[PDB]
Design a protein around this ligand. Structure first.
Ligand SMILES: *[C@@H]1O[C@H](CO[C@@H]2O[C@@H](C)[C@@H](O)[C@@H](O)[C@@H]2O)[C@@H](O[C@@H]2O[C@H](CO)[C@@H](O[C@@H]3O[C@H](CO[C@H]4O[C@H](CO)[C@@H](O)[C@H](O)[C@@H]4O)[C@@H](O)[C@H](O[C@H]4O[C@H](CO)[C@@H](O)[C@H](O)[C@@H]4O)[C@@H]3O)[C@H](O)[C@H]2NC(C)=O)[C@H](O)[C@H]1NC(C)=O
Ligand code: HEM
Ligand code: HEM
Ligand SMILES: *[C@@H]1O[C@H](CO)[C@@H](O)[C@H](O)[C@H]1NC(C)=O
Ligand SMILES: *[C@@H]1O[C@H](CO)[C@@H](O)[C@H](O)[C@H]1NC(C)=O
Ligand SMILES: [Ca+2]
Ligand SMILES: [Cl-]
Lengths: 80, 98, 104, 94, 466, 107, 79, 104
């Protein structure tokens, strides 16, 4: 159940490289994992609330889109 | 010839102005600036006093928050002096100039 | 204290693995403020007659109950937002939490 | 002179419920009215969007409860939900 | 040096002296019996006197299972391997379980009825035999544990007696915690104090001290202001139950024969559910049943419960009202005007000033119950602060909290979230009409009463092991 | 007819259930509005108002003041984590700022 | 019409002191004046648009409040 | 104890008028954190061999001193901004403040 370690150090390094980072400290990975967990917790909580209001057991992509729009992170290309 | 240290009066002012709720900008110059700026959008404009007061309050709050962020940026760079690059970095990260 | 346990102990021990006696039974209370006794450590206020508390005489508890607590029963005010279940569960929870023994 | 309605009487009643001795000023009343209007608008808009998403033409207590859960943070949402549920149950009984 | 019969102030006796012109006691030579609490270590002139807590501070239903190994072993049914608790071997409540009888040398239970000869009851706490409502609670929890063990034995035939006992005890403790922290404390403290002192649960601090504060044992006695002067019994239609529908409280103390021979615990539970409590007003604090006639039948003279509270606070050496106001971060009044402003009742401030002389000398209980009640609450700001702090420490400092990870599974936690005291009453008694949600608020029949069948039941399928 | 009884009195509130219902009906939120929605909304509004007013009154008492001014409202909001999160992008007029000086700037 | 200089250096210093700033560089004042001018330009443009839509020659407090709220800068105390 | 005083009591009694014991001599220490003993209340860690603290064996104090504390004396460096007066006054102040007795 320790799936937060599934976001490996090379993946975080790749994400930093896409962001234009040349050198990465060794303690960056834990901070990135914590930030990702917090963001995912917020978005997934909103999506699960939307799903529960609809009396559904399956979380759809449209619920995730609504959650992201609620946080102010409108996402294009998934759903509509 | 009692002269305080170059940091004592600054801290005294910080403690004084963080405990009050007044407006730190003179009202008449701000009103004149607001009218001059509004002259660029519509000539012969009239302003309610409450409108100018609301504009002043919003501007003062925005500037205070920006200065807090700028102080954080300056402290990050191992400094106590507030510099324009700190303001620019804060505005970029906030998303204003980005 | 065992390294692994699935259930509580009856006496309440080993709940806190650093200080196992925290919360266990037959242990002294925790004082949030220093105690205030007549002589400082053991004698309660009102034990020795003529000794004042903070420059004022100590009022008898029965006298305080007579003057302030006493009120006519017929003027009782019912509670329209609470039931006797509230009070009964309060007493049950109190008997769950604390009990101060006295000599027989 | 037209009649302008505001949440001043009700805010004063709540204040006297909480602080019978403490009074309020005019600017504090203005801020209270603005805050009440803003929260009302936020909750109503969230409930309307919830109703539109599920293809419903009616705003019910469920939509308001879900909007409260979505907007209000932390224990505020739980306490507000409990208060609203109690009020709705009391109204249904009476 | 027997304190119950002698008024000489010799340790451990700390008798209450009678003021002149007492309405009830006309002889100043008499006194109210009183016993000093046992010191933590006797005879020490170096340590400040401290008192002993004889029960586990955690909310673990220690009133049903006990806090000592010999008593806990004696409370169980060792004649089998179903992990049940001991029940009465002489009487039954319409075919249902009853608390076992307890053998003490000086039993006050037979003093109330010398004809019934019904002794006191045996439970996890020695105070369970006061008063039929508490005995009804203890019997209900006993029946609930037995039923839970029976259902678990049905689900898992491979489990032994010890496993059944431990699992049923775990479920009962989790139920008690849920009911306490979800239904009771919000009504006690109020939403403001509940949110200020008991925030959202996060995880298990091992650094939080879970011990019971000395002041808490006297601050939680605010419930003495909610006590009604009568015991009410109702029949199946929630009507007064003849004979004796309303019995004075002075005739129910240590009276287990009322529980045994007078229809069991169903009328008592109905009366608890369908009767309003007593409101705490600054001019109506405590009734005369507990103030003039407490334990009248089993004692040589009636006691004074508020006077006992304040004498115990003095015995425990607790600080005054102002010290605790300072402790909780509240302003401390100094004059009669400041005290009147704080209390919102000027006449009460004059009375308190006359009795004590300074706000610093006001006893903790008196000042706590004299404060105006919080909105949607039943305690003052000081009492709310103390109670909220104590329960926050008891919740965060408990390793076996039901919400703590590893204690219950996620499915088990969701199943436990559906429990309710109304459902327990429906399951473990013959009551078919039961108050709605927040049983501590519904008090008028039949406006806030529903049928027992509409209550969702606890689904134990998550406890099946494979 | 029978004597009139306000819906707020029936629900045990002090905020106007009827006014909230009218605002919901005329606010262009949905085609229809249920009978229990105004009660829930009024209860939530009353709870939030009571929370903020209680905190502001406590702040005013801490300052030895009898009346609530916008400074007390700002102190109440900014000192509460959940209220600060709710009113994060909100400016309160004449509210000032929380007294806070960075440690590194101290002598 | 040079009114941006009406926001004097002591005023900017006071605003920084309220923000907890201890030391200020000499070039900060021009940057603050520019930032204030940009913010006021945006808010006043939105308010004037709201005023023109209402067919009015007077800018009211409600227009400024709506302009600030459109930018996620809700202001309490003016309606 | 007297209501009015002009000088300290040699024992420290009634320096704090509400709780006279506070600060006096021959009194127990205050506990900022609960005690952590091997058996819970009286036994120190390292008393009975084979008992581990926090899941780890208890290290010998002499071994820790040998491994970490020890350093060659000739490599000592002096403090340019302090004198031995500093440590001597520190010891004098410590002897002013506290002293834990031990049995003979
Ligand atoms: C004279 O000093 C008094 C004591 O001073 C202490 O020692 C000195 C040397 C300093 O270090 C000082 O900071 C110490 O407090 C002082 O009275 C003190 O006042 C404070 C602030 O009001 C009180 O703290 C409050 O206590 C309660 C309970 O919380 C405490 O106790 C529980 C149980 O032990 C713990 O779990 C807590 O962590 C705390 O230790 C609360 O009411 C409160 O916290 C809540 O409230 C505040 C605002 O109301 C919020 O910010 C918090 O988040 C909480 O919601 C405070 O923690 C302190 O108890 C009290 N001490 C004593 C001994 O009574 C006094 O002010 C000084 N006199 C003058 C004139 O300056
Ligand atoms: C039939 C009901 C009750 C009886 C017989 C009773 C009687 C007593 C007596 C005689 C004491 C010892 C002296 C003292 O009061 O300090 C006591 C203690 C106590 N009471 Fe009550 N009271 C009752 C109701 C309540 C209620 C409703 C509450 C709380 C909601 C409560 C809470 C307490 C607590 C926590 C103690 C401390 C235990 C102790 O000091 O031994 N009681 N009770
Ligand atoms: C020549 C100087 C010193 C000598 C002979 C000395 C020796 C000792 C000894 C033998 C003990 C008791 C050992 C124990 O209980 O474990 C002790 C404890 C102590 N020392 Fe030192 N030490 C010296 C320097 C210092 C200094 C410089 C300080 C502080 C600045 C200091 C502070 C203390 C304190 C507070 C105690 C606690 C008292 C106790 O444990 O009973 N000492 N010292
Ligand atoms: C133990 O349980 C059995 C049924 O399994 C019951 O008959 C018996 O009376 C119980 N014994 C006691 C002492 O409660
Ligand atoms: C004592 O109990 C008996 C039943 O055993 C009952 O008839 C009697 O009335 C009781 N006495 C009193 C005084 O209640
Ligand atoms: Ca317990
Ligand atoms: Cl205490």
């Amino acid at each position: 159940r320790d799936n937060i370690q599934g976001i490996t150090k090379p993946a975080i390094r790749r994400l930093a490289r896409r962001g234009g980072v040349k050198r990465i400290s060794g303690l960056i990975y834990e901070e990135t994992r914590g930030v990702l967990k917090v963001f995912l917790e917020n978005v997934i909580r909103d999506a699960v609330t939307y799903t529960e209001h609809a009396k559904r057991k399956t979380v759809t992509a449209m619920d995730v889109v609504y959650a992201l729009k609620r946080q102010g992170r409108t996402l294009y290309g998934f759903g509509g | 010839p009692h002269r305080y240290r170059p940091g004592t009066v600054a801290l005294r002012e910080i403690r004084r102005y963080q405990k009050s709720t007044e407006l730190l900008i003179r009202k008449l110059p701000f009103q004149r600036l607001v009218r001059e700026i509004a002259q660029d959008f519509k000539t012969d404009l009239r302003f309610q006093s409450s409108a100018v007061m609301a504009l002043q309050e919003a501007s003062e709050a925005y500037l205070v928050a920006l200065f807090e962020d700028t102080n954080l940026c300056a402290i990050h760079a191992k400094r106590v002096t507030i510099m324009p690059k700190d303001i620019q970095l804060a505005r970029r990260i906030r998303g204003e100039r980005a | 204290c065992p390294e692994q346990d699935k259930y509580r102990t009856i006496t309440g021990m080993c709940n806190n693995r650093r200080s196992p006696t925290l919360g266990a039974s037959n242990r002294a209370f925790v004082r949030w403020l220093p105690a205030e006794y007549e002589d400082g450590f053991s004698l309660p206020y009102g034990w020795t007659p003529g000794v004042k508390r903070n420059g004022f005489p100590v009022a008898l508890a029965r006298a305080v109950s007579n003057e302030i607590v006493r009120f006519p029963t017929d003027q009782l005010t019912p509670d329209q937002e609470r039931s006797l279940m509230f009070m009964q569960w309060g007493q049950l929870l109190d008997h769950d939490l604390d009990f101060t023994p006295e000599p027989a | 002179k037209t009649r302008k309605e505001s949440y001043a009487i009700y805010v004063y009643k709540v204040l006297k419920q909480v602080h019978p001795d403490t009074g309020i000023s005019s600017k504090a009343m203005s801020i209270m009215n603005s805050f009440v209007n803003d929260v009302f608008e936020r909750i109503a808009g969230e409930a309307s969007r919830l109703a539109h998403y599920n293809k419903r033409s009616t705003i019910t207590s469920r939509e308001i409860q879900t909007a409260v859960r979505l907007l209000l943070p932390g224990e505020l949402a739980k306490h507000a939900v409990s208060e609203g549920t109690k009020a709705v149950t009391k109204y249904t009984s009476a | 040096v027997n304190c119950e019969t002698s008024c000489v102030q010799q340790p451990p006796c700390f008798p209450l002296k009678i003021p002149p012109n007492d309405p009830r006691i006309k002889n100043q030579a008499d006194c109210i019996p009183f016993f000093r609490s046992c010191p933590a270590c006797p005879g020490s002139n170096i340590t400040i006197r401290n008192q002993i807590n004889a029960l586990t501070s955690f909310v673990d239903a220690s009133m049903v299972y006990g806090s000592e190994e010999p008593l806990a072993r004696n409370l169980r049914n060792m004649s089998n391997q179903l992990g049940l608790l001991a029940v009465n071997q002489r009487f039954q409540d319409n075919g249902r379980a009853l608390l076992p009888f307890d053998n003490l040398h000086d039993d006050p239970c037979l003093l109330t009825n010398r004809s019934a000869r019904i002794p006191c009851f045996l439970a996890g706490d020695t105070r369970s035999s006061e008063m039929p409502e508490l005995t009804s609670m203890h019997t209900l929890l006993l029946r609930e544990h037995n039923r839970l063990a029976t259902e678990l034995k049905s689900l898992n035939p491979r489990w032994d007696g010890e496993r059944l006992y431990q699992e049923a005890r775990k479920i009962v403790g989790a139920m008690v915690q849920i009911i306490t922290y979800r239904d009771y404390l919000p009504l006690v403290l109020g939403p403001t104090a509940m949110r200020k002192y008991l925030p959202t649960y996060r995880s298990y601090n091992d650094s939080v001290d879970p011990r019971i504060a000395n002041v808490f044992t006297n601050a939680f006695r605010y419930g003495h202001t909610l006590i009604q002067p009568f015991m009410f019994r109702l029949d199946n239609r929630y009507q007064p139950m003849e004979p004796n529908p309303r019995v004075p409280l002075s005739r129910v103390f240590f009276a287990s024969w009322r529980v045994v021979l007078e229809g069991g615990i169903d009328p008592i539970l109905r009366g608890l559910m369908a009767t309003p409590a007593k409101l705490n007003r600054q001019n109506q604090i405590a009734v005369d049943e507990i103030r003039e006639r407490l334990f009248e039948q089993v004692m040589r003279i009636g006691l004074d419960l508020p006077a006992l509270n304040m004498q115990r606070s003095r015995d425990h050496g607790l600080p005054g009202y102002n010290a605790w106001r300072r402790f909780c971060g509240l302003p401390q009044p100094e004059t009669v005007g400041q005290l009147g402003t704080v209390l919102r009742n000027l006449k009460l401030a004059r009375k308190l000033m006359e009795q004590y002389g300074t706000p610093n000398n006001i006893d903790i209980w008196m000042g706590g119950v004299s404060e105006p009640l919080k909105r949607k609450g039943r305690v003052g700001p000081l009492l709310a602060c103390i109670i909220g702090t104590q329960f926050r420490k008891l919740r965060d400092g408990d390793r076996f909290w039901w919400e703590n990870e590893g204690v219950f599974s996620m499915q088990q936690r969701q199943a436990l979230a559906q429990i309710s005291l109304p459902r327990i009453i429906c399951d473990n008694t013959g009551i078919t009409t039961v108050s709605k949600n927040n049983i501590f608020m519904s008090n008028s029949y039949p406006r806030d009463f529903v049928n027992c069948s509409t209550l969702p039941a606890l689904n134990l399928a998550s406890w099946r092991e494979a | 007819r029978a004597k009139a009884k306000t819906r707020s009195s029936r629900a045990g509130l002090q905020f106007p259930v009827g006014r909230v219902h009218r605002l919901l009906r005329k606010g262009n939120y949905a085609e229809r509005v249920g009978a229990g929605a105004p009660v829930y909304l009024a209860a939530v509004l009353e709870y939030l108002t009571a929370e903020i007013l209680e905190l502001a009154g406590n702040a005013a008492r801490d300052n030895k003041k009898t009346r609530i001014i916008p400074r007390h409202l700002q102190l109440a909001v900014r000192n509460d984590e959940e209220l600060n999160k709710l009113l994060g992008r909100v400016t309160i007029a004449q509210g000032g700022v929380l007294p806070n000086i960075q440690s590194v700037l101290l002598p």
